[PDB]
Design a protein around this ligand. Structure first.
Ligand code: HSA
Ligand code: HSA
Ligand code: MG
Ligand code: MG
Lengths: 254, 260
């Protein structure tokens, strides 16, 4: 079973990438997203008809009333990058067992870069093991977030507290920043308002690299995909180094 | 035609920079820097190519300023090996190598090279801009309200310039961030409508001018005047504000908002 999950997840990512390349740098984003999701679901359910799938547009789908295994997909995380021709969007694939991610992929189909997190294994990038880096203090950390405008109210005030303590705040890449953290080139990622399909795949990738990823109180990020689950918004903080993670939590004051 | 020889040599210079840069990119995941080494070495590689071919030309960069075997030169190569140092340091492959050739102070050739992604935009006076040898064009945009805007960082504005940037920012469809010269490359290929930045040095923008103009775009200072900087033995690398647009009409609306 466990190899079979990895093999099928790769086949699904391959199918999504084949689709996406037909649309990149030509509604195109919507057509690409829908076609890539269909391609992934076909692969998944051909192999695992007892599983369920979950995505943004169509929600939960399962040919049975329940499933132990659920695939949570986002064909194009980073829609604004995609629309503007910037090749740092990603396809996100998470497989959840009883609501817990056991596999996550971040795939960049243009750059041909694929991060794979699997419970039990070290994360890989194009098949080679990766690791997060240590970081001596928050003042030395390189921080990413997608946009300064994707924070409001109390969350913006919290972000600013962290932002003003790091070495430098950088912007613009969605899931790719978490990939770079997993590979040891970024120290901290702080975001507000992510939906489950935008973060679940990140969890095994980051943890399997040696990093930490939680909500802004430091609690486990969890969203159990089910027939009745509601795709609510989450705040996320990821770090390469546990000590920097705790400093970030202390600054967020959430 | 001498511009074809200049193009050939510029391409050899970009190839040499890229070979250096690929040796150093994503070497820093174990906690002088790789970025300084890479930058210096890449500049040296380009300079060697340029001056092997053109001993009567000058070169100009950030660290060393003006260099020439003679006291003056008609042709000056202005170089930035790594535009987007923070992207380079953090493993984000959207920095670029910038090469501009100036004849009597005016850019006649510009390259934006991404050596990891293997994407090279070339602007040559007289020709349409190319990306990996294929012609490119900017796109039309119906109104500032429909424009996709990029800038490197929200924090690279201060004072009156920040206030002017905010006026534009709040009028566009969406403001996006993070990628230095690469945003101007995307504008040249017709995927971005507007780029607005403050505080660029000449090695950060001269290469952009032939690229953007040769794709059908417009690039000026914030008053709508020509961006001009004559590289010379006594020139000072001062800071400039830049606005680039795919569409002339959007450019003017942006100038109207900047109120500079
Ligand atoms: N990656 C998050 C979704 O982007 P998209 O919907 O453009 O694909 C970006 C984000 C950060 N905070 C809130 N949303
Ligand atoms: N591309 C400009 C230079 O970046 P670098 O010095 O990190 O390479 C970014 C910039 C915008 N406004 C001011 N500077
Ligand atoms: Mg997503
Ligand atoms: Mg520069």
């Amino acid at each position: 079973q466990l190899n079979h999950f990895s093999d099928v997840a790769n086949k699904a990512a391959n199918a999504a990438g084949d689709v996406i390349r037909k649309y990149f740098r030509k509604s195109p984003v919507t057509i690409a997203d829908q076609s890539a999701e269909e391609a992934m679901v076909s692969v998944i359910l051909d192999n695992f008809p007892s599983h369920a799938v979950y995505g943004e547009e169509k929600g939960w789908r399962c040919k049975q009333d329940s499933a132990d295994y659920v695939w949570v997909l986002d064909p194009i995380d980073g829609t604004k990058s995609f629309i503007t021709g910037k090749p740092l969007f990603g396809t996100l694939i998470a497989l959840l067992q009883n609501g817990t991610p056991i596999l996550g992929i971040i795939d960049q189909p243009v750059l041909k870069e694929r991060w794979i997190g699997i419970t039990g294994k070290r994360t890989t990038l194009n098949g080679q093991e990766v690791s997060t880096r240590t970081c001596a203090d928050l003042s030395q950390a390189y921080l990413y977030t997608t946009s300064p405008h994707l924070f409001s109210g109390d969350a913006e005030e919290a972000f600013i507290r962290v932002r003003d303590k790091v070495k430098i705040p950088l912007y613009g890449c969605d899931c790719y920043a978490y990939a770079l953290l997993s590979s040891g080139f970024v120290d901290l990622v702080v975001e507000s308002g992510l939906k489950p399909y935008d973060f679940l795949a990140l969890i095994p990738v980051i943890e399997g690299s040696g990093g930490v990823i939680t909500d802004w109180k430091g609690h486990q990020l969890r969203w159990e995909a089910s027939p009745l689950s509601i795709a609510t918004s989450f705040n996320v903080v990821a770090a390469g180094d546990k000590q920097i993670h705790q400093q970030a939590l202390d600054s967020l004051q959430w």
